Amino acid sequence: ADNRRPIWNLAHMVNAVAQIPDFLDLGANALEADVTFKGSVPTYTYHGTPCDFGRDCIRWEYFNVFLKTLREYTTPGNAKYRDGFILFVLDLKTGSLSNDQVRPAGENVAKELLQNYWNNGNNGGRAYVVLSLPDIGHYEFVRGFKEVLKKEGHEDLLEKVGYDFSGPYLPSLPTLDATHEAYKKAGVDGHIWLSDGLTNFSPLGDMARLKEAIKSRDSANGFINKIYYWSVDKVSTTKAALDVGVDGIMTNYPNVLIGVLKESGYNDKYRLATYDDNPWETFKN
Amino acid sequence: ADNRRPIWNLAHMVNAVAQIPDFLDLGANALEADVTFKGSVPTYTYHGTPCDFGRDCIRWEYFNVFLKTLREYTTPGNAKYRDGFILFVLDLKTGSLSNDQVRPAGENVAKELLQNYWNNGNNGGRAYVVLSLPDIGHYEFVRGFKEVLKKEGHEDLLEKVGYDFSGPYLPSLPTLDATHEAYKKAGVDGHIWLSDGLTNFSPLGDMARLKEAIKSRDSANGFINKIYYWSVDKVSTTKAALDVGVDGIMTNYPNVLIGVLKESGYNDKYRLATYDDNPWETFKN
Ligand SMILES: [Mg+2]
Ligand SMILES: [Mg+2]
């Protein structure tokens, strides 16, 4: 019945477990954590400096512990279960990996999620997971990731997994075509999130990039399911993001979007996504 | 005769060759470049987002081309020669290396510098180089680095090389003692720079840490030769940094320090370092 676009309110840079309920309390239905690697081994949730103004940059957790904690918050029946916490983005810091490390990294992240988040399929967390890779050329990470899940007999868990290949930002930003191709190379034919944020390096081209992405998402044979925009932290920019048609707002202050979604106008066009909003489904209305 | 503290005016985040002369023109006598790695292979000069307000974050160059350009700007007689450009800091982004990739990374950077910067001692660039590593545990990088120079018969080029081991930030920042020990582990017994101010995740302990570092540098048994404070971009903070006793200012706007150094009550205490100021020599008060 509801014709409003479901919005993911993604708490930005939530790398310490103590912060999780705090961001969820502010109204986030999703969070983003930065997954650091030591070689192919996903090691910490940790962003580091520099980071957004008004944020401490160095909060962290062991990756395993972070995932186990996400599981608690997203397992129905758990004492800590938050039914409003529906998705998390793993901002996978694979940018320094050698080529030989990319597939094993994907395998290692799969193993981590399987063991720690999905608990080997034994009543795991129900939240959707977006694997956000910073290089379209890292699609072997996804191939390895998928291969682990399939080999361990949990291919069904890929229902819960989405992908966002962005970058690299040098020597140039990938075009949408290139991105789409990267997905095909990864064997990804759905569950695709596109983010737009980090680079405000070519303002008029970035305005164009966002609109191009939105148009692509909303196009006949589009491949992008959701678009999220990051560090939207003010009412004005939150409204702008919603009004341009994004599905996801990544923000340091999830309460902002909550307030905006209450507002006249906004409240008849956009709504906070719930678990029953398939994050892999392109919004049409 | 001149008893003023020589100051390194380090242009922050200069990752594109086109930026080099612009920063030097603003008055920097030094610059800092972020050296990215793909496994153990130094690949780009490139910082990436997020970065300082007022800065584009994604300027870049291939590492060798960057080094070649630095060589040009610092080889007497070269068309591009800048006699006032006396040091650069390689902010080596080894944070994601596996333990096994650390030494080879050091070896690789040594080879790059040897071939492309120093040209094997055949009238290469004259600037001093600070190898800035983000983990005191990465001392093998320096061991590998020194090994290469020594093996290739260019141990003398270590006269031009200094070291700044800091971090990592997790679980805590290392003590000065731990940092000193890391130098010992690298076989580094001089040419030590310490940088402060990347984070202010504990303002009180941050203040104390700088004062401790300064005290340590200025102690008879000290190991720190120079202290640089990073992102100091305003006159007020510039003056504050000089007044607290740092030897170096890392800044997005080298012109600020240039103006400060002209001011009364600064111009009699501090001066812009020149090539004849040994950056490995602790300033004696
Ligand atoms: Mg992130
Ligand atoms: Mg840097």
Query: How many domains are contained in chain B?
Result: 1
At residue A35, φ and ψ (nearest 5 deg) are -100, 110
What is the CA(B13)–ligand 2 centre distance, in A?
A: 5
Q: Which chain B residue's Cα is nearest to A200?
A: B56
Judge whether B36 and B28 are in contact, CB under 8 Å.
no
At residue A237, φ and ψ (nearest 5 deg) are -75, -30
Query: Is B34 labelled as part of a ligand binding site?
Result: yes
Which site among B45, B98, B108, B138 would you substitute to test the A interface, given the most A Cβ atoms closer than 10 Å to its Cβ?
B98
Chain Cα centroid distance, residue B185? 20
- Cβ distance A96 to B169 less than 8 Å, yes or no, reads no
- Range of B171's domain? 1-285
- Cβ distance B50 to A46 less than 8 Å, yes or no, reads no
Residue type, B230: W
List chain B gaps (C–N > 2.5 A) by preceding residue: none
> What residues are paired with B30 via a beta bridge?
B10, B87
- Cβ distance B38 to A98 less than 8 Å, yes or no, reads yes
Q: For residue A265, what are its two tokens?
A: 């106008």
- Residue A109's domain is classified under what CATH number? 3.20.20.190
Residue type, B34: D
Q: For residue A14, what are its two tokens?
A: 């939530």
CA distances in angstroms from B97 to A266, B15, B92, listed in the order given: 46, 21, 11
What is the distance between the alpha carbons of residues B36 and B63, in angstroms, rounded to a whole number? 8
CA distances in angstroms from A6 to A160, A278, B190, listed in the order given: 17, 9, 59
Q: Ramachandran region of residue A95, left (φ > 0), alpha (ψ -120 to 50) or beta?
A: alpha
Using a CB-CB cut-off of 8 Å, the residues of chain B touching A49 are: 169, 198-199
Query: Is A52 labelled as part of a ligand binding site?
Result: no
Nearest CB among B38, B39, B44 relative to A170 is that of: B44
3-state secondary structure chain A: CCCCEEEEEEECCCCCCCHHHHHHHHCCCEEEEEEEEECCEEEEEECCCCCCCCCCCCCEEEHHHHHHHHHHHHCCCCCCCCCCCCEEEEEECCCCCCHHHHHHHHHHHHHHHHHHHCHHHCCCCCCEEEEEECCHHHHHHHHHHHHHHHHCCCHHHHHHEEEEECCCCCCCCCCHHHHHHHHHHHCCCCCEEEEECCCCCCHHHHHHHHHHHHHHHCCCCCCCCEEEEECCCCHHHHHHHHHHCCCEEEECCHHHHHHHHHCCCHHHCEEECCCCCCCCCCCCC
List, as ranges, residues with CB under 5 A of the ion ligand 2.
Answer: B 34, 91
- Cβ distance A58 to B201 less than 8 Å, yes or no, reads yes
Q: Which chain B residue's Cα is nearest to A40?
A: B98
Nearest of A113, A99, A228, A54 to residue B37 by alpha carbon:
A99
What is the distance between the alpha carbons of residues B245 and A218, in angstroms, rounded to a whole number? 58
What is the CA(A203)–ligand 1 centre distance, in A?
A: 21
Which site among B34, B49, B233 would you substitute to test the A interface, given the most A Cβ atoms closer than 10 Å to its Cβ?
B49
What is the distance between the alpha carbons of residues A254 and A242, in angstroms, rounded to a whole number? 14
Q: CB B213: neighbour CB atoms within 10 A?
A: 21
Judge whether B269 and B5 are in contact, CB under 8 Å.
yes
Nearest of A265, A280, A217 to residue A245 by alpha carbon:
A217
Kindly give the pairing relationship between strand B41-46 and strand B60-62.
Answer: antiparallel
- What is the least distance, in Å, from the CA of B135 to any CA of chain A? 12
Kindly give the pairing relationship between strand A30-38 and strand A41-46.
Answer: antiparallel
What is the CA(B33)–ligand 2 centre distance, in A?
A: 6
Nearest of A203, A184, A100 to residue A136 by alpha carbon:
A184
What is the CA(B92)–ligand 2 centre distance, in A?
A: 8
Nearest CB among A51, A93, A170 relative to B50 is that of: A51
At residue B127, φ and ψ (nearest 5 deg) are -70, 150
> What residues are paired with B46 via a beta bridge?
B60
For residue B55, the 8-state DSSP code is S
Judge whether B254 and B27 are in contact, CB under 8 Å.
yes
Residue type, B33: A
A175-181 long-range Cβ contacts below 8 angstroms, 24+ apart: A176/A212, A176/A213, A176/A216, A176/A224, A178/A136, A179/A136, A180/A223, A181/A136
